[PDB]
Design a protein around this ligand. Sequence first.
Ligand SMILES: [Fe+3]
Ligand SMILES: [Fe+3]
Ligand SMILES: [Fe+3]
Ligand SMILES: [Fe+3]
Lengths: 174, 174, 174, 174, 174, 175, 174
Amino acid sequence: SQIRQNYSTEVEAAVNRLVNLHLRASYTYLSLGFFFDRDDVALEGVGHFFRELAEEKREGAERLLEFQNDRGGRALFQDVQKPSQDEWGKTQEAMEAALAMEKNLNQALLDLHALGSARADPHLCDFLESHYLDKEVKLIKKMGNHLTNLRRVASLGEYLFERLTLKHDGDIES
Amino acid sequence: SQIRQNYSTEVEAAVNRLVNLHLRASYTYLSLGFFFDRDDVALEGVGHFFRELAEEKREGAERLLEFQNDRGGRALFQDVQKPSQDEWGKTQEAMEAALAMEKNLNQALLDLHALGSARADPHLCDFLESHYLDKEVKLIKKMGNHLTNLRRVASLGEYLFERLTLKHDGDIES
Amino acid sequence: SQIRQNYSTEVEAAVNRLVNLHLRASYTYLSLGFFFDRDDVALEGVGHFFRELAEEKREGAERLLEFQNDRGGRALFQDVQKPSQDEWGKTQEAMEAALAMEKNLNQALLDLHALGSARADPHLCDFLESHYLDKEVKLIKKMGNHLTNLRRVASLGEYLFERLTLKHDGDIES
Amino acid sequence: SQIRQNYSTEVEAAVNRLVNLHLRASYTYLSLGFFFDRDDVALEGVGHFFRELAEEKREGAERLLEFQNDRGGRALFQDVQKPSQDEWGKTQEAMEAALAMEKNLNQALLDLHALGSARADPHLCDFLESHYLDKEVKLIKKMGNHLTNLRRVASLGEYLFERLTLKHDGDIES
Amino acid sequence: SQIRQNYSTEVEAAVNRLVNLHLRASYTYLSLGFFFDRDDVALEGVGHFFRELAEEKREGAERLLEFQNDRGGRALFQDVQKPSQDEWGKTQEAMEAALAMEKNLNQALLDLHALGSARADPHLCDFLESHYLDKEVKLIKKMGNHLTNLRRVASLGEYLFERLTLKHDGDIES
Amino acid sequence: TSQIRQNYSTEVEAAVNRLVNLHLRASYTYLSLGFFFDRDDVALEGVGHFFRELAEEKREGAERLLEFQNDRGGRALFQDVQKPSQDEWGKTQEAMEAALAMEKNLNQALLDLHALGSARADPHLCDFLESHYLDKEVKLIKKMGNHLTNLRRVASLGEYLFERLTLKHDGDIES
Amino acid sequence: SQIRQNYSTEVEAAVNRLVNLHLRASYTYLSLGFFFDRDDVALEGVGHFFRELAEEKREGAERLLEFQNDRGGRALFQDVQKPSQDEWGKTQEAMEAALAMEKNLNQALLDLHALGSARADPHLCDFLESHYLDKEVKLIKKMGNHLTNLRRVASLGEYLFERLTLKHDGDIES
Ligand SMILES: [Fe+3]
Ligand SMILES: [Fe+3]
Ligand SMILES: [Fe+3]
Ligand SMILES: [Fe+3]
């Protein structure tokens, strides 16, 4: 690693378990994503929402892996834990189960900035800030808004929420 | 000054407190619009509605200052009072609080016309007519229609109203 | 709130008073902006300059509120006090008054970034040093350059400056 | 009528009978217009002229009803009195009967403005001035000019007039 | 009436009172449609629906006059009765008031075709069959479908019906 | 007595007639003021074009009063248009001052006519004056006042720069 | 039903058996059509001809059902009778069988128009006249012409006819 410079091994190991955090997160989003496409639920909108969330997480993890080899470090891959559940009931707990993941995923992330801000790594204070932290802050507010809307309609409102909110904006957001 | 002509100080001072009336009005509208973007409410439709009404008011006040210096008058700026409240409960009171703002605002305009119409100022008597009073009538009617609809659905109706009326007519009333 | 996480109240109170700082700042430039389009001054260029600056400040204040309700906090609105003065004399003092009003704004921003760097808020570091602190440094240099040019021409030069510098740039800059 | 404001009933009752004045006016022009496309007359130009005038009056009456519900008023519909005649003879008296219908219509409008101008309704001032009163003054002059031309040619000239004046500008005003 | 041929006065008088049937029908439809754009109701969709039905009727009538003078007859105009009611409660009775008023219109048309078919007028067969009876049948079916849907949702259903059926199909049919 | 005449008195019909001629004298002084600056001894093309276009704005104003007239049934007559106020206008600073003096007098006659009609209750006069004339006059007085405030500040080198950098620049793009 | 008007059951029952006549008619036609693209016959032209005729008949039957539910009546579906044959030999008999099946269809339609014209239903007169009876007359003449041509060539001519008449026009008579 002739390129390695100002990259502590105490932080190098953190992004590795952070990588796998994003991997596990996308893994549970994918499972959440397909549970809602099942016939027993038949909510196309929420399924697409969570599968797109898994896309985002899987692209984030692959970004921490190129940030790694960019910063000279060598990364390893612990196994990816199965999702924290197997059937997610209705959408209202599923979003809270999901919002619980982001706050955790945003929590484990702020630690990495706090870690590097202590070890005085500015490139990390730029890369996290730029890519990850703003996206995480914007993502919690999205699931927060969706939860506030779900509680309002709460299962007729559970049906209308998918059509009038998740499917509409989901088609026009991306 | 040199251009000043048929512009009395008895009316010149009125538009000054009318200027600040619009400034205060947009100030309550801005705070109303951001209150509805909070996670606790999460009503994007009403939020955008009020946040774009605040800009109509701010452009109204800035029109009164373009009218002022046109008539040679000199306008001073009293401070802008904080809004009426700080958190506005649910949209049905917020639209009621808002419709209460217009009728008060439309009242000051009728007052200013009656002032100049008695004091024989034509330029005002048919610049207000043109730029302000018709807009105010249309705005009161729009907010009244929204209130009548809100009471009908009245909180599932609160969510459906946003989705199926405010967001739609906001996208197509850009 | 649900979304609120790693967002203090010691800083939540600061962005609230920074919101109102920006609000007053626009209120300063607005009045400064219209004074210069008055007949007694008749400087179209400086008037447009300061009105566009008020546009910028108002768009900034509205950016701290969409950062606030996003970061979880609940923001309140103290009243916006009237500008500093009421008749700004010559453009050389008004730009000096403005540059004086501007630097104080950059000072509050530096204070807020220091507060966040102490309380270890990285998302605030990103958001500020991206959207606000860079725009501020460029703004002081612009008013600084204008002041250096005004001193040079210093009222024929006051006429030419607005004519050959403010108006030309104002058309082509935006 | 939560929107109702500065809208009297002494005037609200007038716009209601003005609505029916316009309705009967179109009913006058409709029957006057089909009489002229009858075989016994066979004047296509005058028929189209009066049918378009009936269309204009119907669009006017529908404008006083959209002005009504704008001002919160409630409008009731008295029956529409049949036209003042049944066999209009020839174009020279028919234009005279028509010009008699306009001056009466313009008279009711002047009365309605004088009413609101007394009761100090500026929105009605604006609305009448803008839409109705300028259209009326200009419409009387059109029928006035047509009558002056009809007298000149006065039935060969009656054939040419409709052929060479009404039909030409009719397509030009189409 | 040199053109008159196979046109009896026993049927000529029928289309005359059939004209006024359409005129009254549009007159009831017009008032029904403006009542629904009032603030107390604030149903834009049903208002537009009935206001466009009024114009469909008003163009139906103006066709009976274009059919009349074509077939040689001379048509007179009795006065147009004010509508049935003056305020129409809510949507469900207003559509029933309409469908009940609509069926009567189709009833008079069947009477006129029976009259002409007994009196052996084939041009009336063609004209009615093509231009009128098919339209009245389609209109009765549309009003019936709307009534069934209204009863299904029957006032949240009254709001949702407007938004999700009347406004949509009115914009896309037009 | 005309068929179309309605709610149009002679106390106003005579006013718009002398108002017509006011605009005619106004274009006349503006025309002569405009060509004076085209002369070699002044050679200010910017101010010349400014005033020559002001003259056409006034002339189009006067023809609005005449077609407002015959629209409102009245019959209008034409008193002669007396020569402009002056014959040589010296410097632009007096010429703009003489001009701003012509507007305020002209805006005054309009306010007078509308006060006359508003008392006699002619709403069509409201609609026509307030719309086509009074707003234009307010903005014209403001434009000439701005030009005057600029002229005094830059005050004959500044008399030259004002024409190039202000009158001619916008004169091209504001027209 | 609510919409039902001037629609008797003595005729409502007829269109129901006419629906099934068309259904069996198409069922006859498609079976006649696939027999002709069999290997033992190998006449693609006649096969396409009869399959397109089955398309037409099926579109007709669906037009009597959209006429039915439109006239308020309720329609039931008797079972569709197997075609009148299973192996149609040569094209000359199959066209004769078809023209025999066709004329019977026109006969039922003439019966239905006679029924309605006696029972004085003008809407059925219009609907049948317009859509069905004119298409039926043109269809017999087409199969009549084809039969006359088949007799002329009558199996070389059976090959050429399909090749030179049915296929050529069939492509350009899509
Ligand atoms: Fe006006
Ligand atoms: Fe940083
Ligand atoms: Fe027939
Ligand atoms: Fe007025």
